[PDB]
């Protein structure tokens, strides 16, 4: 559809500008390997994921028209899912990062479900457009805590879901299951809200300096 193609190109122009700075990528190879240096790298990565996702969010069609408090509630409420999704994308476009994660002092209670999500979404071989649309769909969720005008958010989310589904008919014709499989990775993704809340209470994790952006977006 003519209005849908315009929507999609707008999403892609914004999504394609997102990149993790090469300098962080180099750190994966170049830094000393210790629990503390490893944790720091993951912190800088997480911080940059939020940075990028804010820039992406403020370019989503309609987002600037929303009530200001609702904007904030979206950013904070969708942060955990969006960041986790983005970290899966980064990881799957690496062996070394995995080893750093496995040796950063983070408990296997949290590491295990993380790698299961990464593997699951990796096996789906999602295209750049699927990542972009899903990301936008996660950010524009009308069910976040404290949203005053949920119907306004729903009107921004629904055309993205339509484009995404419709795309799935276009590129994977006669297989309704590709789209349903995308939505099942979203089911895994949402389980991370609870994993995250528990990690923040944990000893190792909370006895660190998180960056200011992480502190703020996670309501620490």
């Amino acid at each position: 559809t003519p209005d849908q193609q315009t929507l999609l190109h707008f999403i892609m122009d914004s999504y394609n500008k997102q990149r993790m700075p090469q300098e962080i990528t180099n750190k994966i190879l170049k830094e000393e390997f210790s629990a503390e240096e490893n944790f720091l790298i993951l912190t800088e990565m997480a911080t940059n994921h939020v940075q990028v996702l804010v820039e992406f969010t403020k370019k989503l069609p309609g987002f600037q028209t929303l009530d200001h408090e609702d904007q904030i509630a979206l950013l904070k409420g969708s942060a955990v899912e969006a960041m986790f999704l983005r970290s899966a994308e980064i990881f799957n476009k690496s062996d070394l990062l995995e080893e750093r994660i496995r040796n950063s002092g983070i408990s296997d209670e949290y590491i295990t479900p993380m790698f299961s999500f990464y593997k699951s979404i990796g096996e789906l071989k999602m295209t750049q457009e699927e990542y972009a649309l899903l990301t936008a769909i996660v950010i524009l969720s009308p069910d976040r805590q404290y949203i005053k005008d949920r119907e306004a958010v729903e009107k921004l989310q629904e055309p993205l879901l339509d484009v995404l589904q419709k795309l799935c008919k276009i590129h994977q014709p006669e297989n309704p299951q590709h789209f349903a499989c995308l939505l099942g990775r979203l089911t895994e993704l949402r389980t991370f809200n609870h994993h995250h809340a528990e990690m923040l209470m944990s000893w190792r994790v909370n006895d660190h300096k998180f960056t200011p952006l992480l502190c703020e977006i996670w309501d620490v």
Partner: peptide
């Protein structure tokens, strides 16, 4: 405040 600034 941080979030509003970046937005």
């Amino acid at each position: 405040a941080l979030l509003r600034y970046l937005l």
